[PDB]
């Protein structure tokens, strides 16, 4: 027979009837075609098993995955990789739009840090995209009163009332007259992409001396952070300056192309997480080279 799956995107919900033998590719190619999304390499189908994310493997049967099989079997369509330059790599309208929504939520949920002034400018493009051009006779004072435009973090940094925020965002909003939906969403993305925590996947690790650290895996390379500073890495390894990443048991080794440069090894305990890290290393490395 068939089994029903529910597919969750950033703004919609879909439901598909899958033959029992369907691999990830069957389901994934179908979702992308339905969306008219052509830059498929950025995206994947996500589910979460015991507080660790996992991605649908293409060459694997949907039901051989350890996703909860209680109907409907649910997957979240999300970007797994991020482009180095959004304006140039995101061509389809739906693609730009789903990145916009995935990134905006990261910011409002404070998963991606952004300075107060960046959050105000980002909000103004967000409202421009949703409400179109400004018109003071239609969008009367108080029309953004219940709209969620800023991270709670920035409003707890200022002696400012909500009306003061709304007044400030509206002024910047008015500055974007003439900008179409897609244009405002792309502008939002251009600002967001320069943020330090943008597009980076963080994993807690330990160096051989036993010191607890963070691994950052993003489009440009591997990064090592002190756990209290996710903004600025202590060490970076660009993808082109890396010879190989080997994995064994719970130990990673980063081997630089420059043989005189010491090797960097670290441990991670959870093996589900280590599999994820490798996919993210492999995929990001591939896209990095193919762009060059």
């Amino acid at each position: 027979k068939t089994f029903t799956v529910r597919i969750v995107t950033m703004d919609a919900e879909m439901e598909f009837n899958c033959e029992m033998k369907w691999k990830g590719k069957d389901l994934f190619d179908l979702v992308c075609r339905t969306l008219g999304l052509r830059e498929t390499w950025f995206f994947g189908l996500q589910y979460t098993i015991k507080d660790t994310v996992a991605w649908l493997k293409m060459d694997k049967k949907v039901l051989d995955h350890d996703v909860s099989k209680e109907e409907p079997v649910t997957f979240h369509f999300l970007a797994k990789f991020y482009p180095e330059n959004a304006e140039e790599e995101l061509v389809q309208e739906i693609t730009q739009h789903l990145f916009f929504l995935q990134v905006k939520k990261q910011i409002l949920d404070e998963k991606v840090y952004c300075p107060p002034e960046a959050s105000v400018l980002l909000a103004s493009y967000a409202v421009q995209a949703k409400y179109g051009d400004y018109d003071p006779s239609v969008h009367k004072r108080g029309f953004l009163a219940q709209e969620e435009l800023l991270p709670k973090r920035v409003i707890n940094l200022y002696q400012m009332t909500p009306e003061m925020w709304e007044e400030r965002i509206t002024a910047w909003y008015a500055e974007h007259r003439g900008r179409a939906r897609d244009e405002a969403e792309m502008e939002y993305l251009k600002i967001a992409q320069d943020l330090e925590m943008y597009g980076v996947n963080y994993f807690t690790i330990r160096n051989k001396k036993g010191t607890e650290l963070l691994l950052g895996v993003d489009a440009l390379g591997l990064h090592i952070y002190d756990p209290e500073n996710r903004l600025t890495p202590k060490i970076s390894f660009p993808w082109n300056e890396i010879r190989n990443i080997s994995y064994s048991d719970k130990e990673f080794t980063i081997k630089p192309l420059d043989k005189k440069i010491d090797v960097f090894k670290f441990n991670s305990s959870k093996l589900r997480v280590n599999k994820l890290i490798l996919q993210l290393c492999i995929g990001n490395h591939d896209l990095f080279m193919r762009r060059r």
């Binding site: 300075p115 107060p116 002034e117 960046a118 105000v120 400018l121 940094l157 200022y158 002696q159 400012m160 400030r168 910047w172 500055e175 251009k190 600002i191």
Partner: peptide, 21 residues
């Protein structure tokens, strides 16, 4: 774009907000 650039706008926004803390 009357604010010129994003690089300028971010600074305009930061300094006009700076009097609150």
């Amino acid at each position: 774009p009357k604010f010129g650039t994003h690089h300028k706008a971010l600074q305009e926004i930061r300094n006009s907000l700076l009097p609150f803390a």
